[PDB]
Design an enzyme around this catalytic site. Structure first.
Site, PDB file in Angstrom:
ATOM      1  N   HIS A  22      -7.676  -5.901   0.493  1.00 23.06           N
ATOM      2  CA  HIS A  22      -6.474  -5.122   0.755  1.00 23.06           C
ATOM      3  C   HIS A  22      -5.954  -5.424   2.159  1.00 23.06           C
ATOM      4  O   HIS A  22      -6.702  -5.353   3.138  1.00 23.06           O
ATOM      5  CB  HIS A  22      -6.811  -3.632   0.631  1.00 23.06           C
ATOM      6  N   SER A  35       0.855  -1.193   0.000  1.00 20.07           N
ATOM      7  CA  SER A  35       0.000   0.000   0.000  1.00 20.07           C
ATOM      8  C   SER A  35       0.888   1.238   0.000  1.00 20.07           C
ATOM      9  O   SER A  35       1.658   1.405  -0.954  1.00 20.07           O
ATOM     10  CB  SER A  35      -0.988  -0.102   1.152  1.00 20.07           C
ATOM     11  N   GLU A  59      -9.540  -6.270  -3.597  1.00 19.92           N
ATOM     12  CA  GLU A  59      -8.925  -5.185  -2.837  1.00 19.92           C
ATOM     13  C   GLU A  59      -9.965  -4.345  -2.117  1.00 19.92           C
ATOM     14  O   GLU A  59      -9.825  -4.050  -0.932  1.00 19.92           O
ATOM     15  CB  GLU A  59      -8.086  -4.287  -3.760  1.00 19.92           C
TER      16      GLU A  59
END
Length: 566
Positions: A467, A214, A347
Site C-alpha cells: 500500500h 487510499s 497491500e
C-alpha cells in the site's frame, strides 16, 4: 520513526528548501478566478521541464471560530491580485514523521499546475484528492509535486480538505448543524470551484478526472456517489480504496463526547454541552488526543479511525452521505462514467513494522473472528455464527498449522482492499448505464526511488509492493532523485502518468504513445465474468487473471445466506 530516520528527514527538508529556490523562476503570471486575480510562477523540475504553479487558492472561508465543525462557506472575493507563489498551511494533524502537532485550521486551499497557460484546445483536468486516513495529508509539493504529470498536456489540481475531528465531527442533534462530513463537503466545494474556474487555466470543464489513493480513493468514490456533485466530472480513478472499505466510514456520533471527556470536559452526554466545550478548545489539543478516543473493543472490531465519513443523522441542504455507501451505489450518478480501479500486489505489507509493535496480532488468525465483516456479527465477537465465518476467512489465508505474520498481511490485503473492491464491482454492475470499468494491479518493486509513506511505516529494505508504493511514480516528493531515462523507475513514471493521462483524455487506455508497445488487450470488466482480468504493471505490462480471485470468492461465500448484504 527512529532517530536516524528523523535526522535524514531533517537534512532533506533543508535541501528541498535550497532546491525549490533553485527551481523557482522569475516568470510570474496572473490568472483570473471567480473570486479575484491570482499571481503564480513558472517553476522548473529536475528533468528540466517547466510548469506554471498557483498555490494557496482559497475555495472556502477559513473554517474558524463559529465555522468550526460546520459546512464550508464560499470565500471572500478580492479586488487586487492574490499572492499564490507560496503554499499555505496543511490541515491540523499529527506530523507523521516528527510527532509534532502541526498545521492550521486555515487550510481550505487548492493548487493548480500546468505546463502551458495558453493552449488552443483546453485540456483534460486531473484533480487529486490525497489520502491519509482522513487524518493526515496535504497538497504541498514536497509530498505531492506535479513535476512528472506536467510532462503531459494536462491541468493538474491538488486540493486540501479538513481532517480529523475538525473535518468529521458528527452530532445527532439537528439544532446544532454538525451532521458530519464537513471534510467531504470541503471536497464538494473544491470540485465546484474547479468546474467553474479550470477554464481560466486552460482546462476543459467538460473533461475533468478525479483520482485519489487510499482515503483519497474513498473520497473520489464519495464524490462519485453523492448527488451534490452530479455530472461535475467525467472519469474517476480509485487507487487502493473506495467507500465500501470498512475503514472508509464510521458511525462516530458518540465519539465527540469521548473526545471532550479526554480533553477534560465534565458534564452530561449531551450534544449541545459537548459542542459548546469543543468549540472553545485550542485546536491542537483536540487533534493530539484523537489517538486515545477509540476504545479497545472498537480497535478489536477493526474500527481504524475515531472520526471519518459517516451517514449523516438528519437531512440538510448540504448533506453528502444520506445513506450507507452500498445504498448510495444504487442511485449513484458516478456509476455511469468511465472508471478505473486497482490495488498493489501486496497491500497489507504496509503493516510489517506494526506487527512488531503488537506481534500478538498474528494470533488473531487462530479464529479470525475479528475480521468478519461487521454487518454480519456482534461487538464482542463471541457468537457461534461469527466463528463459522471466521473459519472460512482462516481457510483463505492461513497456509499451515500456525498463523504467520505473512498470513496476517495477506488477509489485510483482502479485508481492507480486495474484498471491498469486489463488492463494489458487483453492486455497480446493477446500477450503471454500462460505461466501462478497467482494473489494474500495481506490481512494480523498486527501492532506489521511494516516497515518505515508506518512512512513516519503517518500510525500508522490505521486498514487495505495499500500500502506497505506487505514489512514487505519480508524484515528485522531497526524497526523490533525478533518475536516468534508461532506468526501470523512469520508465514506470512515464508508464503510470501516461496511462492516467490517457484515461483522463478518453476514458480508455491504449495511448499507444508509450514505452510499452502493445501486446496489451485491455478489455473492461463484464457482468457475466466469473474472473476479473487486470493489467499487471511490473517491469512488464501484461493482462492477467487477478491472482487474488480465489480468495475474493472465499470471502464472498460468507454472504451465502445474506445475499442482500453482499
Amino acid at each position: 520513526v527512529s532517530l536516524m530516520e528523523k535526522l535524514k528527514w531533517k537534512i532533506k527538508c533543508i535541501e528541498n528548501k535550497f532546491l525549490n529556490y533553485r527551481l523557482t523562476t522569475n516568470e510570474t503570471v496572473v490568472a483570473e478566478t471567480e473570486y479575484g486575480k491570482v499571481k503564480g510562477v513558472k517553476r522548473l523540475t529536475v528533468y528540466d521541464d517547466s510548469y506554471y504553479s498557483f498555490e494557496g487558492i482559497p475555495y472556502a472561508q477559513p473554517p474558524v471560530g463559529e465555522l468550526r465543525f460546520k459546512a464550508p462557506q464560499r470565500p471572500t472575493p478580492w479586488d487586487g491580485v492574490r499572492d499564490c507563489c507560496n503554499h499555505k498551511d496543511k490541515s491540523v494533524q499529527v506530523d507523521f514523521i516528527t510527532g509534532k502537532v502541526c498545521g492550521s485550521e486555515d487550510c481550505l486551499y487548492l493548487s493548480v499546475y500546468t505546463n502551458n497557460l495558453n493552449p488552443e484546445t483546453k485540456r483534460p483536468v486531473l484533480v487529486y484528492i490525497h489520502g491519509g486516513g482522513f487524518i493526515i495529508g496535504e497538497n504541498h509539493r514536497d509530498m505531492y509535486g506535479p513535476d512528472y504529470f506536467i510532462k503531459k498536456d494536462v491541468v493538474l489540481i491538488n486540493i486540501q480538505y479538513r481532517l480529523g475531528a475538525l473535518g468529521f465531527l458528527s452530532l445527532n442533534s439537528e439544532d446544532l448543524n454538525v451532521p458530519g462530513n464537513a471534510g467531504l463537503k470541503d471536497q464538494v466545494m473544491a470540485l465546484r470551484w474547479i468546474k467553474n474556474n479550470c477554464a481560466n487555466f486552460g482546462g476543459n470543464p467538460d473533461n475533468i478526472t478525479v483520482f485519489g489513493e487510499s482515503a483519497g480513493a474513498a473520497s473520489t468514490h464519495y464524490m462519485m456517489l453523492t448527488e451534490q456533485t452530479r455530472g461535475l466530472f467525467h472519469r474517476g480513478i480509485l487507487m487502493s480504496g473506495n467507500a465500501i472499505c470498512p475503514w472508509a466510514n464510521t458511525q462516530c456520533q458518540h465519539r465527540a463526547f469521548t473526545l471532550a471527556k479526554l480533553a477534560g470536559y465534565k458534564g452530561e452526554d449531551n450534544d449541545k454541552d459537548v459542542l459548546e466545550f469543543l468549540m472553545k478548545a485550542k485546536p491542537q489539543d483536540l487533534i493530539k488526543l484523537e489517538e486515545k478516543v477509540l476504545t479497545l473493543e472498537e480497535r478489536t472490531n477493526k474500527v481504524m479511525f475515531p472520526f471519518g465519513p459517516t451517514v449523516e443523522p438528519y437531512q440538510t441542504a448540504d448533506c453528502v452521505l444520506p445513506k450507507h455507501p452500498r445504498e448510495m451505489v444504487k442511485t449513484a450518478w458516478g456509476n455511469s462514467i468511465p472508471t478505473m480501479m486497482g490495488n498493489t500486489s501486496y497491500e497489507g505489507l504496509f503493516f510489517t513494522s506494526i506487527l512488531k509493535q503488537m506481534p500478538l496480532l498474528v494470533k488473531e488468525l487462530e479464529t479470525c473472528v475479528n475480521f468478519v465483516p461487521s454487518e454480519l456479527a456482534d461487538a464482542e465477537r463471541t457468537a457461534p455464527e461469527t466463528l463459522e465465518m471466521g473459519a472460512k476467512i482462516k481457510k483463505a489465508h492461513v497456509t499451515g498449522e500456525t498463523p504467520t505474520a505473512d498470513n496476517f498481511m495477506d488477509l489485510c490485503s483482502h479485508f481492507y482492499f480486495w474484498f471491498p473492491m469486489h463488492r463494489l464491482l458487483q453492486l455497480r454492475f446493477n446500477h450503471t448505464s454500462g460505461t466501462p470499468v478497467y482494473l489494474y494491479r500495481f506490481d512494480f518493486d523498486s527501492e532506489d526511488l521511494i516516497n515518505p509513506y515508506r518512512i512513516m511505516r519503517s518500510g525500508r529494505g522490505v521486498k514487495g509492493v505495499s500500500h502506497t508504493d505506487e505514489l512514487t511514480y505519480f508524484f515528485w516528493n522531497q526524497l526523490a532523485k533525478r533518475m536516468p531515462k534508461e532506468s526501470r523507475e523512469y520508465k514506470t513514471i512515464e508508464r503510470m502518468t501516461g496511462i492516467w493521462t490517457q484515461f483522463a483524455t478518453t476514458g480508455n487506455p491504449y495511448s499507444n504513445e508509450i514505452e510499452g508497445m502493445e501486446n496489451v488487450s485491455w478489455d473492461p470488466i463484464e457482468k457475466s465474468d466469473e474472473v476479473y482480468k487486470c493489467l499487471n504493471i511490473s517491469d512488464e505490462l501484461k493482462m492477467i487473471d487477478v491472482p487474488e480471485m480465489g480468495k475474493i470468492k472465499q470471502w464472498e461465500s460468507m454472504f451465502e445466506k445474506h445475499r442482500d448484504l453482499f
